Design a protein around this ligand. Sequence first.
Ligand SMILES: CC(C)CCC[C@@H](C)[C@H]1CC[C@H]2[C@@H]3CC=C4C[C@@H](O)CC[C@]4(C)[C@H]3CC[C@]12C
Ligand SMILES: CC(C)CCC[C@@H](C)[C@H]1CC[C@H]2[C@@H]3CC=C4C[C@@H](O)CC[C@]4(C)[C@H]3CC[C@]12C
Ligand SMILES: CC(C)CCC[C@@H](C)[C@H]1CC[C@H]2[C@@H]3CC=C4C[C@@H](O)CC[C@]4(C)[C@H]3CC[C@]12C
Ligand SMILES: COc1ccc(N2CCOCC2)c2sc(NC(=O)N3CCC(C)(O)CC3)nc12
Ligand SMILES: CCCCCCCC/C=C/CCCCCCCC(=O)OC[C@H](O)CO
Ligand SMILES: CCCCCCCC/C=C\CCCCCCCC(=O)OC[C@H](O)CO
Ligand SMILES: CCCCCCCC/C=C\CCCCCCCC(=O)O
Ligand SMILES: CCCCCCCC/C=C\CCCCCCCC(=O)O
Ligand code: NA
Length: 385
Amino acid sequence: GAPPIMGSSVYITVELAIAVLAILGNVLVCWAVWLNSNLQNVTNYFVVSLAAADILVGVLAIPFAITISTGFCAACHGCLFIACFVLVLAQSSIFSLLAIAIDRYIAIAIPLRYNGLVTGTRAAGIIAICWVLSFAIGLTPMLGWNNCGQPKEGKAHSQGCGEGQVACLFEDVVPMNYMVYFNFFACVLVPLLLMLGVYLRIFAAARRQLADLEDNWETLNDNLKVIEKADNAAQVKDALTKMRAAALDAQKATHGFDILVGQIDDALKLANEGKVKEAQAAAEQLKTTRNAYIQKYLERARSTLQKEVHAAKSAAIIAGLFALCWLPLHIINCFTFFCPDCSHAPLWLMYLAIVLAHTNSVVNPFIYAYRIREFRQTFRKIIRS
Ligand SMILES: CC(C)CCC[C@@H](C)[C@H]1CC[C@H]2[C@@H]3CC=C4C[C@@H](O)CC[C@]4(C)[C@H]3CC[C@]12C
Ligand SMILES: CC(C)CCC[C@@H](C)[C@H]1CC[C@H]2[C@@H]3CC=C4C[C@@H](O)CC[C@]4(C)[C@H]3CC[C@]12C
Ligand SMILES: CC(C)CCC[C@@H](C)[C@H]1CC[C@H]2[C@@H]3CC=C4C[C@@H](O)CC[C@]4(C)[C@H]3CC[C@]12C
Ligand SMILES: COc1ccc(N2CCOCC2)c2sc(NC(=O)N3CCC(C)(O)CC3)nc12
Ligand SMILES: CCCCCCCC/C=C/CCCCCCCC(=O)OC[C@H](O)CO
Ligand SMILES: CCCCCCCC/C=C\CCCCCCCC(=O)OC[C@H](O)CO
Ligand SMILES: CCCCCCCC/C=C\CCCCCCCC(=O)O
Ligand SMILES: CCCCCCCC/C=C\CCCCCCCC(=O)O
Ligand code: NA
């Protein structure tokens, strides 16, 4: 058989290439948030909490993965920490991803009291609590749910491990039922589905508001084309009482309205006196008020919704890339567990799956750089100076 040092050289160098990209790219994220005050908000705090996980992936987790690739002798609980620490960072990433989506829902759903609800110092507390839980979840094997009780003594003596030591291998110390049932199903798969459900609600609530706003603009123009051809002298009272509610229904969304509703009740009084031809003249004052004031609100509020949807889509790419990079490893675990008769995945595909999961730590800085204008210009200034 070919020497394992040669095949490891490709894996180790590709691993070291990723760690350099992971650290550099995400230090740039934190650096941009520490400087540009316009990026300092609750959403980007979870982003920095996310980048910090990715930095630690390159600083500690990737070096660990290289060390296990050797199969070095070590005490079981020590090896158990090397093999599990990446689960802590990966769990921290999920909590950060779920926080980002929930924050975006709160902003798109109830924007009126978002500033009072989502606080800067409350996010710091949530981030802290999520990091503590991530150590608890990721280091659960160290609490007893491990295979240190039944070591492979034959593999340990084959490689000359000392007393109380074992050949360090992820599958040899971490039980596959923890990985599939506890880690993947409950602490990875369910939160991603919940995340997916939140994003469905955001895009639905966004699409509805964008419709809800235009139905007022259609009711305001259609009723403006009904008043000037009315058989009954008080028929326009129907189209004016409905426009008063439609103007207030759009005024509750987000000076020119007091001019609009003021002209509304002016033509409404002329409908209570049967003067149809004179209210029809007063009903055309609204056309001038609409073009100068109301249409601008429609366009500003349609632009703000679009900017939130775009920011909602940008965060959704991040969570989607997370699943794309980690699912292969999780599914590989699902086959080994649920099918002891199947052929176990070769070592080259494993390394491929492992490298794929580490690459997720490099793609987050390129997304903000390509999809967020404020992040992009801050990234350039840091490098230019
Ligand atoms: C501030 C940062 C860098 C601290 C990093 C701590 C890391 C590098 C330390 C903390 C605990 C350590 C482990 C504790 C126990 C053992 C068992 C021993 O037989 C082999 C080394 C091994 C597996 C250690 C490897 C290094 C280790 C994982
Ligand atoms: C949103 C999606 C990706 C959810 C994840 C789907 C996962 C959990 C599904 C999709 C394909 C499934 C695998 C398909 C094939 C086999 C081989 C069979 O002998 C045992 C079950 C096993 C190993 C399945 C385990 C569960 C599995 C990995
Ligand atoms: C989820 C999206 C990104 C697709 C990712 C591709 C992954 C999930 C696919 C591509 C190749 C697949 C592997 C091909 C070969 C084997 C050997 C077999 O005995 C068990 C299943 C296993 C280990 C498959 C697991 C799933 C697999 C790793
Ligand atoms: C998402 O789950 C994992 C996360 C992280 C790791 N790493 C730990 C640190 O070092 C790098 C790898 C691993 S390793 C792994 N499965 C594994 O080793 N198996 C033995 C061979 C097999 C074909 O039977 C399949 C099962 N799953 C994971
Ligand atoms: C805003 C920044 C906030 C930063 C907040 C960082 C706090 C992280 C602390 C986690 C400790 C919780 C660990 C819980 C589980 C530990 C189990 C364990 O480590 O057991 C090892 C044992 O000694 C082997 O024999
Ligand atoms: C900025 C700070 C960054 C800090 C970055 C730290 C990187 C640590 C990574 C791997 C160390 C793994 C340590 C374990 C590897 C050696 C264990 C060993 O050689 O064991 C011999 C055996 O016990 C004979 O019987
Ligand atoms: C900014 C800090 C960067 C830290 C980089 C650390 C580099 C670690 C890379 C490789 C270390 C691998 C250790 C050797 C594995 C065990 C070999 C053996 O004992 O047989
Ligand atoms: C290890 C499995 C998971 C363990 C879950 C139980 C521990 C976490 C449960 C609840 C913590 C909720 C955080 C409450 C912080 C109080 C904030 C405050 O002081 O206002
Ligand atoms: Na990550």
